[PDB]
Amino acid sequence: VPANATGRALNDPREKRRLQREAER
Amino acid sequence: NPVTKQFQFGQSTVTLETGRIARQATGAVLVTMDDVSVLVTVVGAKSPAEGRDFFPLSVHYQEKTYAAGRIPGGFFKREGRPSEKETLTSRLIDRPIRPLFPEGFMNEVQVVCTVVSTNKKSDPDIAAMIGTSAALAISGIPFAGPIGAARVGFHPEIGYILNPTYEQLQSSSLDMVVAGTEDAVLMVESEADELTEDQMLGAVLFAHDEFQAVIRAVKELAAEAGKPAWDWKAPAENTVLVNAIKAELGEAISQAYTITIKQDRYNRLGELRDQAVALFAGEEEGKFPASEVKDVFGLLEYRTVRENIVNGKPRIDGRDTRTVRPLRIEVGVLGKTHGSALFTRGETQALVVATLGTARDAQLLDTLEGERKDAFMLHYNFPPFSVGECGRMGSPGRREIGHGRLARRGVAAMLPTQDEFPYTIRVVSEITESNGSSSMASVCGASLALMDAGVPVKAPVAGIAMGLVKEGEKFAVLTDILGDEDHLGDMDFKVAGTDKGVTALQMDIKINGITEEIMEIALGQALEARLNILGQMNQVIAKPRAELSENAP
Amino acid sequence: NPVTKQFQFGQSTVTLETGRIARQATGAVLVTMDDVSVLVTVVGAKSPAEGRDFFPLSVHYQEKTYAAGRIPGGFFKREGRPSEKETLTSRLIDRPIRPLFPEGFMNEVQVVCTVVSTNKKSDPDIAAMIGTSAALAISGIPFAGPIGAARVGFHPEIGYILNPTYEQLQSSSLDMVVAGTEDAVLMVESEADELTEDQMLGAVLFAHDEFQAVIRAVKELAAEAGKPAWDWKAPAENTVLVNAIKAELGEAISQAYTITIKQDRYNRLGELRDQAVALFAGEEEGKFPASEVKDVFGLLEYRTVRENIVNGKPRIDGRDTRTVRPLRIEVGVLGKTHGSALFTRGETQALVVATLGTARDAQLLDTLEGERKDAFMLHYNFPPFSVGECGRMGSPGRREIGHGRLARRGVAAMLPTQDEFPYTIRVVSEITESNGSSSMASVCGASLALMDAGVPVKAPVAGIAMGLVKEGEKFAVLTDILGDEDHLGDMDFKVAGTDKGVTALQMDIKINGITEEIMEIALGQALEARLNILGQMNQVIAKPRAELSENAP
Amino acid sequence: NPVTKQFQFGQSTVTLETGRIARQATGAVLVTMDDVSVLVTVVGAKSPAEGRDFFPLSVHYQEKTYAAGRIPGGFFKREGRPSEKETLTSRLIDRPIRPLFPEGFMNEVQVVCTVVSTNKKSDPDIAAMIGTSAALAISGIPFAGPIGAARVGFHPEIGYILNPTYEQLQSSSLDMVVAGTEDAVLMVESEADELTEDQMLGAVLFAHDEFQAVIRAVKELAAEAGKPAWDWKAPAENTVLVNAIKAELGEAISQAYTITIKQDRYNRLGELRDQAVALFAGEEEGKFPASEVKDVFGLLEYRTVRENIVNGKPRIDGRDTRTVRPLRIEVGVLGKTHGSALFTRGETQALVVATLGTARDAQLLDTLEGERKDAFMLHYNFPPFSVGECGRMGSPGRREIGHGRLARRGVAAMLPTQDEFPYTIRVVSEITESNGSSSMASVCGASLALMDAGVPVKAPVAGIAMGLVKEGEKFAVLTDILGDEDHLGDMDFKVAGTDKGVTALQMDIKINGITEEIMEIALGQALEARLNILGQMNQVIAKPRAELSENAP
């Protein structure tokens, strides 16, 4: 897919925060 | 004596050496990042000049060719007047630091960054920003906190890329430069390939989260090799005089900004200025100060306009916060030019002309990293008669070169590669009227003139310049910011793009407190404005002319 | 809404459009004439600068390469410093309009004439002058009458040609630009091929009759879409102080001006000026500023030296009104130059040197219409020591470029073509002394130097700077005006040419009272002077030397 | 009425002509010397400008291309910005004549030297200096005696050559320009091929003996055609105030100068200066006017330090007259540069970088005698941060061109030829700190960078800046003069060279009385200093690197 299609990157700080919010919870 | 500090910025080792070179400047640091060494110096005047009513800050980024192992090109074989990359870097370093000097500071300051060594593999400017931060930290000059900077890229597979090299930036869909302090982002200049607003805000938050290493290392450097802090005391406020004009002749300020006609509003206000200066000219006890009472009134005007905007009142021109000024769009306005467009947004007007040529008309950019051929040139002109004033009609200054790069940044993603279109292109945007962001009118005019000349651009691109006024916990986002409002806002951004995604983003924050959600709301309002403008543009010309111009090679 | 006015200038449909482009300048007009479109904007400041004692008027004529659908040349690929053509055209537009602004107007006025499109067949300067007149008529700024301009060529078969194209100019024997109002002519800039004075006068009256259409169209456009006139107060004259100094001190100034020694007169008139700034400089703790007294003194002096010139008395130097100053001519002054000449007329001296080169030494002119090669260059240098002052040494100014172009116009008719003389000729005229018209001593010196080098010029050329003072119904023509008599005159005409015809004519009228008979008497006296100076020139060198100098290139 | 004076300057006939050309300048002379004709004009302002505290003297040396019979190269085919040779001649004419105007003379003076003819076989600068001397002698402007100038070359068999031609300078081992007066020598600008100090002083004495003819001829020309001498009366010294301040604060300012801490000194002195201003100044009758006392206090400081230097007491910084400030030498300070060095001498630092290129990178000089390719260039940069100040960051000024030609002269003798090293060398000396002679730290950094890069330079070369304070019959030679001490001295010289001989010598004597013995003692102390600096330098890098830098071509 093009760049515009791709979603939130894995190093995106907000994605990391959501991930740690799921692992912690 | 040489105090060297080493830290890890990403995967790159940065070396900040002080004490050895330039020991007579107020601050001087040698920054070595990825085999790129830059010597940054900061000299601050020890006394304020008599009559100095403005802060004289100067930033001079210089790229010496010996850093690349080359002898300068040209007839004189010496480096000369700043190139365009050195003027853009000078303004990229100048923009973040100026808001951070304390209010009332009027001593002259001159930052001079000199690239002295380079491997030619990475841009030498994030090292000049790190060096400016470290020099202003070890100097002692009144400055607010260490700043940091970082360039971000984006490749769909890898994700965001910190401090991308010149080879990493050839396959990336973003080229963003974010600068900020430990708790706020202060500057964003980016270019992109139709990336969503989410992807362009995640980059700003990635860069903000990444250059905190620079701030920590400049705080340790300042706490180790720092000069004693200057004994400069911020002047106190005329609380009394302010709390006075506020009532004595303040309700008339409220009833003078409810006029949308510039003449009437200006006259009625000016009459108030005189009425109130006389009523309490200077502090009351002696009534001696003159400009004091005129500028305490100017502060009650700034606060009044902002309070009204935030409280949900009609703007100075009667519009609401989400209204774009009326647009008049014309294509084909000049008979014998390859492409032409007259774009009017209210009282802002840009006459953009696109010309096509052959490979012999391409510009030879003698860069530090070598020699390139630029087959696209956008030249933004801002003649003083656009603001109804007389002035110098000379060479482009820093403001025109930066406003031409913002427009080029907005339009670049749509332009055809040399394989698709084997011709040089020179867009020339002349600002005939200005009461707002004329750079975004240059982006719209460029799109129109290029689709009128026949250039196979991918899609129509439009730009919008906006602002944000935050007063405590209440904030208001202003669409299509005016010229008067440009200095009245807390964050003024400028978003260009197509109907799919952003192709350029410039932001210049001045306050602390603009969270992520505020930026998402502002960028959504910018998207709706841009889509409105783009839809009105498609009613004139929607696609590149079927056949090339009648006068083009 | 855009008001558009269309009229017929001779055979060309001329369109003036206002209200669409540049609606933030005091006046703006887009002029389309013969597929040439020029945007002209005038901005006048609302209030004059504090302490300003001169009227700042600035005209900037710019040719944009995209008008021709071309990309600029040069390393930077952008329009930078104005070319010689742009400088000359801005001066040409400036000359006719400065005397029209009322006396006492100190507000800054800036005119900008940008060529936005062209078909490369006509000179865009006439359209620029039309746009200047229209914009000044719509601005509301105090201005005296609409001006009209026209270019005239000549052919022996067709007669006079109005606004000739480049192709017509190739065959034409005349290239004259005339500008004037409904009642008078105010500017003539001509380049002829040995045309009699009758033919030049007929061309000036042809142009005056022709551009009445321009004047009428501008008047109608100003009536339709003119901005309200400015409320400007013509300052009153201090007739009490005028009569006071012309009564008590009247005969003193006259006696002073009967002195012929310059230094004695200045010493005798500084004294009188101190006495005047004493007897009447106080009335109520000061009658009026020191400058005011010196201004009424200047004005009275002026009035008296013009009453003396008109009444028949000797001139400031003792000469009659038909005397050419004593001439000293020399050739071969410099040993190693290809050709040299020292021409002295009174206190005006010019050292002119002619050099020969090959076809590689021709100047590559980048013209809006293409790329030409100049095989003749005339450079005029006016150093401050020619007048005995310490000035600045640097790039040639407006006046040096204009004077050099006038000398080139006065000599170009005699230059051989490349077929007979396949060499490049560069003439440099250094003005070593100036107390008159240096440009016409540069024409005489260029003729002498070219003959000395061996260049096969057709015939000798000489020039004479003339003047006319007209008080009421009486007038006097002054031959070989001095540097002090330049501002005293009402018309300043400079005629160059050979003994058979006129090669160049430049007129600058300021009063609305000069008829055709006065210009025939003026051109007859100018002929007598030019033929006396040619008689004296032919005694030194009469024809080019049989052999070229020691070094051909 | 031309006046012509012929005289013999060696075996050349010099012709001075006055009265024919430039008769409105204060003084104008045409000098013809060996088929080189130069017109030199001097103009002096009649009245000093109000609010003028410094003496404005400017010299402008111009080489006109038509003198050589050539059309100038370039796009504009016209002489434009001054070349390096022109700026260097201007400063060479400016050095000997600035100190000769009476101190307190504030009228503006402008000298213009135009080269109008040449046979391309000798340098016109000597003729320019002769013309300057003659014009200043004829002008009448207060000027302390006619000067003379001469160029000296040296050959082992011929001996000394007076005014060598361009051909005689190819086989010569010296290129000295000595300027002086009948009883003193005021300027020496030399470049030698490792000549002994005896052979370098014997040439300044041969030169002083040989140009006395110029002074005699100028005296006769002035006693025959000189204008009356201006009635300029020097402002008498305020012996009263001087005596009172000397008595009250002699020990005060004495002690103030016996402290080496820089800031402490400034403090203590400002306190004694503000105390001195408080008394004896003000508006009350008897209080001396305004800053006159303040400037008398400055003078009282000057006399103090000088009397301290000649009495054998320690210098301002604490050093003796024979100590060279601590040197910190480093080579290879930058990674990607071909050669680099950091030379610190106390508070004078230089970052010298050497870069190697190819034949295409050689500079094209369009000299008056033709076109020459330069395969060695040295560019000296003096940024304002070097001194802790803020200031313009643009083109190199006269000061930088002259200091870089002095460092070039110092290092020129050791460079290889295009047969032993077929490369182009560019040396850029960045003055990162300045508190002394930066040009000699640039000579030492140039040597160290050229050997760090692998250039086969013949031997190490170092330079020392010296001074001499003569207080009556006692004198004191100061080694490694500081920036503060630069103005106190009565003779500042700069001796570059290796351990075998002198390679450059610049003297600027300012008084009369320096005999040959004082110039033998001074150069024998500068030999000791230079040999100490060479000894310290050789402990870092002695010989050129084994092989050309790996990154270099």
Numbering used by the authors:
A (entry chain D): 983 to 1007
B (entry chain A), C (entry chain B), D (entry chain C): 2 to 554
Publication excerpt:
At the core of the assembly is the endoribonuclease RNase E, which initiates turnover of most messenger RNA (mRNA) transcripts and processes precursors of ribosomal RNAs, transfer RNAs, and small regulatory RNAs (sRNAs).
E. coli and P. aeruginosa are distant bacterial lineages, and their RNase E sequences differ significantly for the intrinsically disordered region and for the region corresponding to the identified binding sites for PNPase. To structurally investigate the interaction, the complex between the PNPase core and an MBP-tagged version of the C-terminal end of RNase E (883 – 1057) from P. aeruginosa was assembled and analysed by cryo-EM. The map reveals a new mode of interaction between the two ribonucleases, where a region of the intrinsically disordered part of RNase E from residues 948–964 interacts with the RNase PH domain of PNPase by the formation of an α-helix. Residues of the α-helix form several interactions with the backbone of the PNPase protomer, and one example is shown in the right panel of Fig. 4E. Moreover, two Arg residues form several salt bridges with negatively charged residues on the PNPase. Although the interacting area is smaller compared to what was found for E. coli and S. enterica, the number of interactions provides sufficient stability to be visualized by cryo-EM. Only a few residues forming the α-helix could be modelled due to poor resolution, suggesting high flexibility. We also structurally characterized the interaction between RNase E and PNPase in P. aeruginosa, revealing yet another mode of interaction involving the docking of the end of a long helix from RNase E to the surface of a PNPase protomer.
